[PDB]
UniProtKB/Swiss-Prot annotation:
Function of the molecule: Acts as a processive, ATP-dependent zinc metallopeptidase for both cytoplasmic and membrane proteins. Plays a role in the quality control of integral membrane proteins.
Protein's UniProt name: ATP-dependent zinc metalloprotease FtsH
Higher taxonomy: Bacteria, Pseudomonadati, Campylobacterota, Epsilonproteobacteria, Campylobacterales
Subunit and interaction comment: Homohexamer.
Protein family (similarity comment): In the central section; belongs to the AAA ATPase family. In the C-terminal section; belongs to the peptidase M41 family.
Binding site for ATP: 14, 54-58, 185
Length: 249
């Protein structure tokens, strides 16, 4: 099919500097696989960006490809529960060769979990555990990444050395860093005189960085029914305070 090299970049993301750092070390890898293959040591093995619901894990994922000018082949842990019996790992083990060709690169599985499901049990789960170790080789500079949230409900053999050996901990942003977030989405949004982000940063907490992202533009949208200009604090105040109704379907 021929894959992508996204246009995403840490400092171009959404102010989530703390995992970036970690993830940063994977860039330097793909960037200079040689410096390492000169000192002796390396890690063509996955990493398990793990955290709550919406912290741009699925973003940062990309943000290491585009950061390194390297590709991002990756359907993600999905269409395999979506494919029942027979003819399943034909784009899945012909997935690695692509990268093995176009190398160094990033294979980013989605929501590992999915991987797995006469019998009635796990099998696809019982796959990448070879490639993440040995295959046609193990010399190419490529690197897997896969998000999680409930790391528990997963096979433990994932973490066996020479497989998912590391885990980046992206998470809800401190009541001091969300303040950095808001201060990103604010670009554009013409604002008031007394728009105090800190306050709309206050017990405006608990939520993720795509939630805050939302708060802003929303508060903006309350300028439609009210043909106004300067976006004022009380706009952000109507933060649907902190919507809790969720979990009900």
């Amino acid at each position: 099919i021929n894959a992508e090299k996204p246009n995403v970049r840490f400092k171009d993301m959404a102010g989530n500097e703390e995992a970036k750092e970690e993830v940063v070390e994977i860039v330097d890898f793909l960037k200079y696989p040689e410096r390492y293959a000169n000192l002796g040591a390396k890690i063509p093995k996955g990493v398990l960006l793990v955290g709550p619901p919406g912290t741009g894990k699925t973003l940062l994922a990309k943000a290491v490809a585009g950061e390194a000018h390297v590709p991002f082949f990756s359907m993600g842990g999905s269409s395999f529960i979506e494919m029942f019996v027979g003819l399943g790992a034909s784009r899945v083990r012909d997935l690695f060769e692509t990268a093995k060709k176009q190398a160094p690169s990033i294979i980013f599985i989605d929501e590992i979990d999915a991987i797995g499901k006469n019998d009635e049990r796990e099998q696809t789960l019982n796959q990448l555990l070879a490639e993440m170790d040995g295959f046609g080789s193990e010399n190419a500079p490529v690197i897997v990444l896969a998000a999680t949230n409930r790391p528990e409900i997963l096979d433990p053999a994932l973490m066996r050395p020479g497989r998912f050996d590391r885990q980046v901990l992206v998470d809800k942003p401190d009541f001091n860093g969300r303040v950095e977030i808001l201060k990103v989405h604010i670009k554009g949004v013409k604002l008031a005189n007394d728009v105090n982000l800190q306050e709309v940063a206050k017990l405006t907490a608990g939520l993720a960085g795509a939630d805050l992202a939302n708060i802003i533009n929303e508060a903006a949208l309350l300028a439609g029914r009210n043909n106004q200009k300067e976006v004022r604090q009380q706009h952000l105040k109507e933060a649907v305070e902190r919507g809790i109704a969720g979990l009900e379907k």
